[PDB]
């Protein structure tokens, strides 16, 4: 297991997200779904010029999986996935500029719900999650598990779990007071409100209870 420091700017963003009083936490789902939609668009586009990129799975979709036993909400997609380089360096690099702009915007009167406009919507996960575990598989790279409970560090390891074929699983380990996001009717409400025109099937799994 390798342990890495976030760049200071990203640590700062995560702190702001965790510490700021902001009631409209539900926007985290829309951001993650948007991210999944963008990853699906990317693999779809690449497949037009190299069809073998779908040898790791032709189906392009999103699954939302609540688990009350584990207190997790998992957002799964069969998008392009992330390389080791994405996890350790590239995403962080890109996020530095978006973070600065977002911070500036917040000082000028913007609110947290606008985070996606700055390309750093993933970190809104921390509105509701005490820990985020990301399982990902990109073509021509290995399956990785990234994890962070914030605090300035994250880990990356090669994943020995169920092989995914291609895609990303964002596993939200929900805060004790955020378990409404495990409830079917609440997830349906939020998807209808903020994610109604996504161009891929979104399947909301039901709890076995
Ligand atoms: C490791 O966790 C992330 C970090 C630290 C920053 N951004 C994203 C969003 N993100 C970036 N590329 C992504 C792809 Cl291909 N797919 C999805 N679903 N989300 C992505 C993720 C998941």
Swiss-Prot record:
The subcellular location is:
Nucleus; Cytoplasm; Melanosome; Cell membrane
Q: Interaction with NR3C1: where is this region?
A: 1-209
- The residues that hold ATP are 35, 77, 96, 122
Top-rank taxon: Eukaryota
Q: How is it modified after translation?
A: ISGylated.
Residues bearing the modification N6-acetyllysine: 42, 68
Q: How does it assemble?
A: Homodimer. Identified in NR3C1/GCR steroid receptor-chaperone complexes formed at least by NR3C1, HSP90AA1 and a variety of proteins containing TPR repeats such as FKBP4, FKBP5, PPID, PPP5C or STIP1. Forms a complex containing HSP90AA1, TSC1 and TSC2; TSC1 is required to recruit TCS2 to the complex. The closed form interacts (via the middle domain and TPR repeat-binding motif) with co-chaperone TSC1 (via C-terminus). Interacts with TOM34. Interacts with TERT; the interaction, together with PTGES3, is required for correct assembly and stabilization of the TERT holoenzyme complex.
Function of the molecule = Molecular chaperone that promotes the maturation, structural maintenance and proper regulation of specific target proteins involved for instance in cell cycle control and signal transduction. Undergoes a functional cycle that is linked to its ATPase activity which is essential for its chaperone activity. This cycle probably induces conformational changes in the client proteins, thereby causing their activation. Interacts dynamically with various co-chaperones that modulate its substrate recognition, ATPase cycle and chaperone function. (Microbial infection) Seems to interfere with N.meningitidis NadA-mediated invasion of human cells. Decreasing HSP90 levels increases adhesion and entry of E.coli expressing NadA into human Chang cells; increasing its levels leads to decreased adhesion and invasion.
Q: Which family does it belong to?
A: Belongs to the heat shock protein 90 family.
Q: What is known of its domains?
A: The TPR repeat-binding motif mediates interaction with TPR repeat-containing proteins like the co-chaperone STUB1.
Record-given protein name: Heat shock protein HSP 90-alpha
What gene codes for this chain? HSP90AA1
């Amino acid at each position: 297991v390798e342990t890495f420091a976030f760049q200071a700017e990203i640590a700062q963003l995560m702190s702001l997200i965790i510490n700021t009083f902001y009631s409209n936490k539900e926007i985290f789902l829309r951001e993650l779904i948007s991210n999944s939609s963008d990853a699906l668009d990317k693999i779809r586009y690449e497949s037009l010029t190299d069809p073998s990129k779908l040898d790791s799975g032709k189906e392009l979709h999103i699954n939302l999986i609540p688990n009350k036993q584990d207190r997790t909400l998992t957002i799964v997609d069969t998008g392009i996935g992330m390389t080791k380089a994405d996890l350790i360096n590239n995403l962080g690099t890109i996020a530095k500029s978006g973070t600065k702009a977002f911070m500036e915007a917040l000082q000028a009167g913007a609110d947290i719900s606008m985070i996606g406009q700055f390309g750093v919507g993933f970190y809104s996960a921390y509105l509701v999650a005490e820990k985020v575990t990301v399982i990902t598989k990109h073509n021509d790279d290995e399956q990785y598990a990234w994890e962070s409970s914030a605090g300035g560090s994250f880990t990356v390891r090669t994943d020995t779990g169920e092989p995914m074929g291609r895609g990303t699983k964002v596993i939200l380990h929900l805060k004790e007071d955020q378990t409404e996001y495990l409830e079917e009717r609440r997830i349906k409400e939020i998807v209808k409100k903020h994610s109604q025109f996504i161009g891929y099937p979104i399947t909301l799994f039901v709890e076995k209870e």
